[PDB]
Design a protein around this nucleic acid. Sequence first.
RNA 1: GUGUAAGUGCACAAGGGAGCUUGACUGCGAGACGGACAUGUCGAGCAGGGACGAAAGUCGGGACUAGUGAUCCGGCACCUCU
RNA 2: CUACAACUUGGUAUUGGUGCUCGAUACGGUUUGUGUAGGAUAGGUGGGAGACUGUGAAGCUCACACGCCAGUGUGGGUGGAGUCGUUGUUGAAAUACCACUCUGAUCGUAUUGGGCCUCUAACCUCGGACCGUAUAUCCGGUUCAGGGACAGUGCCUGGUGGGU
RNA 3: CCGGUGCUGGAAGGUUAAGAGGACCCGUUAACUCCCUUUGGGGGUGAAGCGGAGAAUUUAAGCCCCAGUAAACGGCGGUGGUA
RNA 4: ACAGGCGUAGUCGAUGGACAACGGGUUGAUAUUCCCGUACCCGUGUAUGUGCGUCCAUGAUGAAUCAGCGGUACUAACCAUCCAAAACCACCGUGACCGCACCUUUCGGGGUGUGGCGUUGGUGGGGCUGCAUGGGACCUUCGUUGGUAGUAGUCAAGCGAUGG
RNA 5: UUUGAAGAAUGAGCCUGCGAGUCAGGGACAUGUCGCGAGGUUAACCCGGGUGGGGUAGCCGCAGCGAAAGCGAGUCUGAAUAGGGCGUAUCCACACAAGAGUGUGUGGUGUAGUGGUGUGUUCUGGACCCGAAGCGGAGUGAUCUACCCAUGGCCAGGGUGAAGCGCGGGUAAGACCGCGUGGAGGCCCGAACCCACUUAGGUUGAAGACUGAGGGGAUGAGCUGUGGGUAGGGGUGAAAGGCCAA
RNA 6: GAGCCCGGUACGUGAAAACCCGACGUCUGUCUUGAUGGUGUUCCCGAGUAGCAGCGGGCCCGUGGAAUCUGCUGUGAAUCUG
RNA 7: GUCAACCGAGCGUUGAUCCGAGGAUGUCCGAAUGGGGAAACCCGGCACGAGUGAUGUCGUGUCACCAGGCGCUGAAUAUAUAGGCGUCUGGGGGGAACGCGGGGAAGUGAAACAUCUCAGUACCCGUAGGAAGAGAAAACAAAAUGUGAUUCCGUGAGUAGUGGCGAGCGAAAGCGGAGGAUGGCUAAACCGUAUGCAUGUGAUACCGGGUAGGGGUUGUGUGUGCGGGGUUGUGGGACCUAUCUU
Lengths: 151, 77
Amino acid sequence: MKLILTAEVEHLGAAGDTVEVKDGYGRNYLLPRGLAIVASRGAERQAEEIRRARESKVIRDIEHANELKTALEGLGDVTLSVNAAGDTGKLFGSVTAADVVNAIKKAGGPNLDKRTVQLAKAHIKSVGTHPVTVKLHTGVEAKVSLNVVAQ
Amino acid sequence: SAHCQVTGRGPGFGNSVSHSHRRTPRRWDPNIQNKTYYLPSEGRRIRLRVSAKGIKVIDRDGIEAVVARMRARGEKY
RNA sequence: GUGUAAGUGCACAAGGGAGCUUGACUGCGAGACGGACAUGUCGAGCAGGGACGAAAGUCGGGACUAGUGAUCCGGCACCUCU
RNA sequence: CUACAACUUGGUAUUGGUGCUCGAUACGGUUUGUGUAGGAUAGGUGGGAGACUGUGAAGCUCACACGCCAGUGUGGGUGGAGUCGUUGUUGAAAUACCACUCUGAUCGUAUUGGGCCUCUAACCUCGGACCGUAUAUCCGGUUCAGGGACAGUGCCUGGUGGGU
RNA sequence: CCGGUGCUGGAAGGUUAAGAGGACCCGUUAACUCCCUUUGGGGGUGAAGCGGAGAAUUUAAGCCCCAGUAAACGGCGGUGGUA
RNA sequence: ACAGGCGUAGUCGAUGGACAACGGGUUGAUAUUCCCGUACCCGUGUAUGUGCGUCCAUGAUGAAUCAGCGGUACUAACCAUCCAAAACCACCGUGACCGCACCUUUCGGGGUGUGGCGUUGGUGGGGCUGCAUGGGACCUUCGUUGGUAGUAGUCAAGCGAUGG
RNA sequence: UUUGAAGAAUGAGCCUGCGAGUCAGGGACAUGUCGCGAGGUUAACCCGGGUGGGGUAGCCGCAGCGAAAGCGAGUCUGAAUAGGGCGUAUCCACACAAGAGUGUGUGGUGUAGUGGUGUGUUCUGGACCCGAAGCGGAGUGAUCUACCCAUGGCCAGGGUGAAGCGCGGGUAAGACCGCGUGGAGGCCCGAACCCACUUAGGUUGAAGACUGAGGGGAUGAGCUGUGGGUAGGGGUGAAAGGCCAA
RNA sequence: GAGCCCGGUACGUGAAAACCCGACGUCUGUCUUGAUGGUGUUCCCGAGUAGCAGCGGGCCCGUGGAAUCUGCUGUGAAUCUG
RNA sequence: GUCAACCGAGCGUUGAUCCGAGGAUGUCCGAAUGGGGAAACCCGGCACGAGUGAUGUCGUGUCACCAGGCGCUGAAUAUAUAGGCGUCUGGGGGGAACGCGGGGAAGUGAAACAUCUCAGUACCCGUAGGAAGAGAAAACAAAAUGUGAUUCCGUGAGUAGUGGCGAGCGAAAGCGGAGGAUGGCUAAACCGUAUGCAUGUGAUACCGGGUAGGGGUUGUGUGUGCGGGGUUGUGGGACCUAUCUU
């Protein structure tokens, strides 16, 4: 399995490397963790490796970082870009978690995980202003104040 | 069997042998297994009945692709 | 006595002995026997190329009859067939 | 007699990581070429007129060892300019520098493999707990704990086989 | 009574499938060197490649082999002479 | 392979469990079934009245605090223990090692007891730094009570499980 | 049908009716007949109210020998015209050679097959007709009988008198002994009931496996009822190769 | 035993409604913003597939020298000098 | 109506009886479908309506199962999912043969028999249709300057061949014919697109050059769904780039 590493591993090398390894290793251990990527294309593999490396470096957190993000979760109003019909007051399409987290990227700063976003508690597809909360800690969770771009 | 799911590599029915024949089949099964996988899209673990061949197909083709191809066939996965 | 059972024959020797020696060949074969059929048996004579012999002539295994097994399927050498 | 079920053996896909040990393959410096003339195991071989030394050498005792035990090269260290130039003998010349590199024994580097001690992430759990579930010794899902690349299944293969 | 057959155990050996290997050869031919009448036909070497049947070697169980086992199937003899 | 095989929820299934009627008379034929008489078990209406509690509120409970007495006790830090960081003195068969007289083929190699730094090495005790332990408290504080705050709320006609 | 049957070898009660060499197919071979004649004939199909017209793709003949290349009234083998094999419709007339059996070269006479149909035999198909035991596939069946499950019921009557318990003797205490109670038992005699040992009868039966008189068990490894389950190379079997709808 | 009795035939007639054929006009698209040819090189021409090996089926073909077509496993390529 | 008469009572020129096409009603079982069930018979729910002094009763409807679409929720558990609730459309079974894909015997013949044959037949399964399936060359052929989708019929051919070279099986090419549509539609390179998982030259790039505001038609990636372009064999096509430019 020709794949491009993302992190450092025993007897393979370091991040960014290119290795031909055993198929099952790459099948079961690395590739389903987001720790590697198939080598199918030059620029496709290059871009994926670069972006995945940046995101893996930037995704980390600790318990105390959660205790601090529990305070920093009361950010300013992070707005969301929308294409919908304002005719009746219903939205065409549901809006991603990437969109919310990239809005936080370009307004507040923290580039969080789409996973922990309680978007279900947002209940998008009703035109208004949805609240939000996120599994920051085991026990501690803080809240964000939000608004929507009228369509 | 429960039948394959990604390709449709069903059985077959052989027959005779060497050392004088005797006429007599022996199904040539396919090699299905019970490997599981993970759908990052919908956040879920799926178990399938897939041959090693089909695993090959997956790892050089994706899983989303495969479930869409199976949705076509409307297998009750 | 005849290599080996028995018979028919062998002294005119097919018995015994000595010298050369490879016909213990190739290509054929008139006419005949015996014959359910397939098998089986002899066969003069012609040609090349030889043996022996001075020559005539004899030699296509053994004095004769037994000593072995069809067809199919494969194997080896040679062919100016495909 | 021939064959089949069932059982069983091994190879292979599922099916991987590190460590050790035992093989041969190739990139690599290496041990090592007893024919008399005679320092004489004369590495055969193509340029070929100095020979590497001094970015520290003879003869050397000793760390070493083979051994065709006459002999062979190797290193702490003195030594501080020593054997040597066709040394001359020859099919053939140095064993001077340089080198395509073979009959060799050793050993680094990619490997190709196996066996053994293990980790877990595939896989298995009629082990537990919770949920779907109000009822469910079913089934599924999450999780804990455990086993573990073994087992199970598929394909090829050898064997026993009146069980049929 | 452990020889015969079977069961259990243990491999120092011998035979031992598949698979991994792929030496050496045989087909084909890019390219040459002679033969000949001439309007190139017939001979030899014949690179790599593609193919053919392929050995050497490494190969487990089993079998042969070594012991145990009969409230396991099973088996248990004769002649002669002397008071 | 497909046909189909099993099977949980559940649903059917008495040969059993629970559940309210006995005697006499009658026709040409039925009879605990109709008739005569006396009884019983479900439900359902109308009305009668004895006690009824919701509204009134009649009695009877808790929340839980600001906090006071003494005490788990990040704990600033305290009462007793050893071992070994660097380690202190005494001594003992010392890798190379500096080296009394002699065995020893007549000698280049095979050594010994005392002798000296080193102390790859060995035993003993004492100023000893790191160590955690049980005991008593201080911060946090958890245990015992005065106001309170059984005040606003709360239980009290009934039927009451498809649950125990 | 038998060497041989009036045959005491088989078959037939009698009548009436029914009941066994057939058809397909350009099939094969042989032979009659008809058309054509070195030629013969079409198939599918198209057109046709009909049985008729067309349709040249094909087949059979017209030259064979040889494994084959290949050659050709010759060819194959072989070194060979040197013999032979096969073939050259057959006869006829003249020659030359031998009478080892006749051959060889000329001349003329000139070659007859094919398509319909009929008959006989024949090939493939059930192939003159009737007749098995038994093989395979898919299903039906445990209401009889074999066994198991779930739930109820039945076993008159009379005897024997285990364990235990009590009293008494005995004991140092026991063990032990006697009297009583208790009333167990794959216990006993005997009806119902379940079986079926002997024997007689029946034996074109009352009966497609019974009756009469006797007999075994008869509180248990019981008999039975209602409902249910196991199904064919499979079930079930206190096991006989027994039972699974006479 | 019927041409001339009857029923009916040869022949010609007949459908308010439903059904089927086409026929139309609706309705629907669809090319119209276009084409013929030129010219030198990069890119594409249907991937777990075709191919090869191991067991097998069926093809005139019974594993045979055995193509083409294929089923299960295992391995596994290129895009037109393919 | 009739076997099938008898009796009684009636209707009909105002057009009956009779025939044809469409409608209505259409008890109960049956795929059977509210639940259940020994088939045609037992019990119910919900909305409405009729009815009783109230209950009982009665009538009209509707309630199964799965597959898909849409809608609400997203349990363990965070994303979120399986699942749950509502609505909408389908399927469900029967059939005489005919078809396609799959499975798949045996008696028979071989004078035995296993390979073979009987036969890939019978039978079984899954799905159809009025017909099915196949079908446009990764084909045949042999140097002929050929053919040109497929299928079904005739012949080739009982041949070449295959085969315990035994029984027996057995083509195709080619040729003549029926019918003709020598038929069409897509993917990919390449653009324009909505996007969706990612990131940030955070800039000399997103476009027709150029005169240029911005300061990103997101800057660059990558698959997804839509739209263009493209459908070939003597190769074509998309980029490119001239020419006439209906």
